[PDB]
C-alpha cells in the first residue's frame, strides 16, 4: 500500500532533480569509474561529431526490419493503392469473411456488447521495426513518467503495451535521451512495434491502480527507422580546489588514479562557459591537473560529458486490459 506512496515520492524527487540538474550523476566511490562508465565515449561537439549508425547493434536489431528508402516505399504503396484496381470485394458490399485461427474470446466479447472492428493491413505492415512517434503532454495529467516504464500505445488502429525511450525533437543527427517526460514541449517516443505507414495518431496511456487508463500524450507517428539513435548523457562534476593562472587542480570527479588516465581524451567544461583540457593525474586519490582557457572562480564547477548510444527494450505486448470506466479523481 504505502510503498506505492514512497515510490511516487521518490519519482517526484527524481523528476525535480532531473529538471534542476539534467544529467549530472555522482561518481561511485566503490566501483571504478572506468568500469561503470566503460561503455561511454566523449564527444567534442554533440551536433557535429560523427557516430556510426551501424555500430554495436544488439541482438534485438537482429530481429527487426529496415527500409532502404522509406519515402519511396510509401510513395510506391500509396500510388499502388490509389491507382491499381485489386480484384476483391469493393466498397459497400455486405461481405462475410472467414478468418482461420482466432480464439473464442472475441466471440464472447461480441455477446458482451464490445465493438469489434477489423482492418486490412497494407503491405509490410505486420513486420516489426523501430517506431519513432512524436508526442506532447496534456496538462490533465502531471504525474512523473520515467523514460523506460511501460505505457499503453494507441497508434493507427493498433493497441499495444510497450516501454519507450524519450528523445529530444531536434534536427541534428543524434538526439539526447530524456530520462523523464517533461510536460512543456514535444518529445520522441522510440519503441519496438510493427510497421505502420504515417499519418497515424499517437495516444499514450498510463494504467492507474483502480484500473483506469489516464491519458498522458498525443501526437503522430514520425517515422519507422532504427537508424535513429538515442544518446544517454552522463555529466560528471568536479571541484577546482586550487586555481592558478590558466591552470586548475580538480578533485571529486574521479577517485582512482587510472580513472583519470582512462578519461583523458575527453574535453572538459565549466558551468560558466570556460572550456579546458585535462593534463595529468595528480595521484592515488583522483586529483587531476587541468589546463583551461582562462581563470576560474572558486564557485565554479568543472563538468564532463559522456555519451552512450541507447536502444529501446523489447517489451512488445499486443494485450491491453479493458479499463474500468474513467472518473475524475
Amino acid at each position: 500500500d504505502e510503498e506505492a506512496e514512497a515510490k511516487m515520492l521518490e519519482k517526484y524527487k527524481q523528476e525535480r532533480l532531473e529538471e534542476m540538474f539534467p544529467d549530472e550523476v555522482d561518481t561511485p566511490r566503490d566501483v571504478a569509474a572506468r568500469i561503470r562508465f566503460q561503455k561511454y565515449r566523449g564527444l567534442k561537439s554533440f551536433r557535429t561529431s560523427p557516430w556510426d549508425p551501424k555500430e554495436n547493434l544488439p541482438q534485438d536489431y537482429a530481429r527487426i526490419f529496415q527500409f532502404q528508402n522509406f519515402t519511396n516505399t510509401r510513395k510506391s504503396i500509396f500510388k499502388e493503392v490509389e491507382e491499381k484496381e485489386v480484384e476483391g470485394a469493393e466498397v459497400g458490399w455486405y461481405v462475410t469473411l472467414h478468418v482461420s485461427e482466432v480464439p473464442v474470446s472475441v466471440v464472447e466479447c461480441f455477446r458482451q456488447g464490445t465493438p469489434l472492428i477489423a482492418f486490412s493491413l497494407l503491405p509490410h505492415e505486420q513486420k516489426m521495426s523501430v517506431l519513432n512517434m512524436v508526442v506532447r503532454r496534456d496538462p490533465g495529467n502531471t504525474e512523473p513518467v520515467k523514460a523506460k516504464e511501460e505505457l499503453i500505445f494507441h497508434c493507427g488502429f493498433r493497441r499495444f503495451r510497450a516501454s519507450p525511450l524519450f528523445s529530444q525533437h531536434t534536427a541534428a543527427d543524434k538526439h539526447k535521451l530524456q530520462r523523464f517526460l517533461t510536460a512543456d514541449m514535444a518529445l520522441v517516443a522510440t519503441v519496438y512495434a510493427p510497421i505502420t505507414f504515417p499519418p497515424a495518431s499517437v495516444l499514450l496511456f498510463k494504467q492507474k491502480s483502480n484500473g483506469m487508463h489516464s491519458l498522458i500524450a498525443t501526437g503522430h507517428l514520425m517515422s519507422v527507422d532504427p537508424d535513429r539513435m538515442v544518446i544517454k548523457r552522463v555529466v560528471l562534476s568536479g571541484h577546482p580546489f586550487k586555481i592558478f593562472t590558466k591552470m586548475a587542480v580538480v578533485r571529486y570527479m574521479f577517485f582512482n588514479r587510472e580513472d583519470v588516465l582512462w578519461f583523458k581524451p575527453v574535453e572538459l567544461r565549466t558551468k560558466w562557459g570556460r572550456r579546458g583540457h585535462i593534463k595529468e593525474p595528480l595521484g592515488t586519490h583522483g586529483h587531476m591537473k587541468c589546463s583551461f582557457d582562462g581563470k576560474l572562480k572558486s564557485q565554479d564547477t568543472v563538468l564532463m560529458n559522456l555519451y552512450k548510444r541507447v536502444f529501446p527494450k523489447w517489451t512488445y505486448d499486443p494485450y491491453v486490459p479493458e479499463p474500468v470506466p474513467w472518473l475524475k479523481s
Binding site: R34, Y40, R41, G42, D52, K54, E55, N56, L57, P58, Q59, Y61, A62, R63, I64, F65, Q66, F67, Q68, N69, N72, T73, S76, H124, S129, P226, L261, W262, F263, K264, P265, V266, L306
Partner: peptide, 23 residues
C-alpha cells in the same frame, strides 16, 4: 593501454544489421 577514445577502435559495425527492404 586503452582509454575511452582508442577503445572505440575495437568496435565493429557489421554484425547485427536489420533486414533491408529494397525499393
Amino acid at each position: 593501454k586503452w582509454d575511452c577514445e582508442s577503445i572505440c577502435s575495437t568496435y565493429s559495425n557489421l554484425y547485427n544489421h536489420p533486414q533491408l527492404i529494397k525499393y
